[PDB]
Structure formats: C-alpha cells, structure tokens
Amino acid sequence: KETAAAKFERQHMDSSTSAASSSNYCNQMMKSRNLTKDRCKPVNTFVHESLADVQAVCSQKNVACKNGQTNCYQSYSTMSITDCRETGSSKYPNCAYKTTQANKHIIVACEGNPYVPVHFDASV
C-alpha cells in the first residue's frame, strides 16, 4: 500500500516548478495527483521546494499541530507554495480550483525512522 511519506509527496510536493505554473495549475495538479478520484478534495497545498528542503523542516521549529499532537514543525524560511481551493461552480467529477501562489512558512507533521513529513498542517 502507499506509505504516509509517499502520500505526502503525492499530495503536497511539486519541486518541478518554482511557482504556480498558471491559472490552470490546480485544475491539472489536483487531477494528476489523484485528489479528485472519489470526490473534489476541497483545499490542498503544493510546496515548490526540493524534497530535501521540505524533509529538513522535521528538524526545524517544533509547534503544536492543529489536532493537538506535538509532532509539527514550522520552516524557518518562507517557501514557495500554491493553495488550491475548490470553486462554487465545481461539481464532481469536473473539480475546479482557484490557484493562489504565496511565500509562507509551512507547518508539517513528521513521523517515522527516518523522521519525514507525513501531513501538511498549515502555512503561516
């Protein structure tokens, strides 16, 4: 089955570009990463940094997770991210998203050995 670490790379890593490729980015990426298979996932964030740079966040600023667990980490630097947000017009199976580019600190939950990101918690 899919590891949590692999699921995080699928759902949240896009190192291939430095920014939100275009107004079409989220429509294409939400589909191609399989986040519209069984329903339109309402919101999703993609990080445009290297895998190494996002994995390194697991050794950065320890912060509380939104669910109250203690294993979340905030990046010391801002990172290039794209927020995908489903539209009102959006009806499964034709999921439609607003693509928003920003530079924000990310917060990820990390687990395992090796200790790696398994959940995208927030951007700040």
UniProtKB/Swiss-Prot annotation:
Substitution effect: residue 119 to A: Loss of activity
Chain sites annotated for binding substrate: 7, 10, 41-45, 66, 85
Disulfides per UniProt: 26-84, 40-95, 58-110, 65-72
Catalytic residues (positions): 12, 119
Glycosylation sites: 1, 7, 34, 37, 41
Outcome following mutation: residue 12 to A: Loss of activity
Main location group: secreted
E.C. number: 4.6.1.18
GO CC annotations on file: extracellular region
Catalytic activity, reaction form: an [RNA] containing cytidine + H2O = an [RNA]-3'-cytidine-3'-phosphate + a 5'-hydroxy-ribonucleotide-3'-[RNA]; an [RNA] containing uridine + H2O = an [RNA]-3'-uridine-3'-phosphate + a 5'-hydroxy-ribonucleotide-3'-[RNA]
Keywords: Disulfide bond, Endonuclease, Glycation, Glycoprotein, Hydrolase, Lyase, Nuclease, Secreted, Signal
Enzyme class: lyase
Tissue: Pancreas.
GO annotation terms (biological process): defense response to Gram-positive bacterium
UniProt family annotation: Belongs to the pancreatic ribonuclease family.
Record function comment: Endonuclease that catalyzes the cleavage of RNA on the 3' side of pyrimidine nucleotides. Acts on single-stranded and double-stranded RNA.
Protein name per Swiss-Prot or TrEMBL: Ribonuclease pancreatic
Species assigned in the record: Bos taurus (Bovine)
Gene (name only): RNASE1
Residues of the full protein shown: 27 to 150 of 150
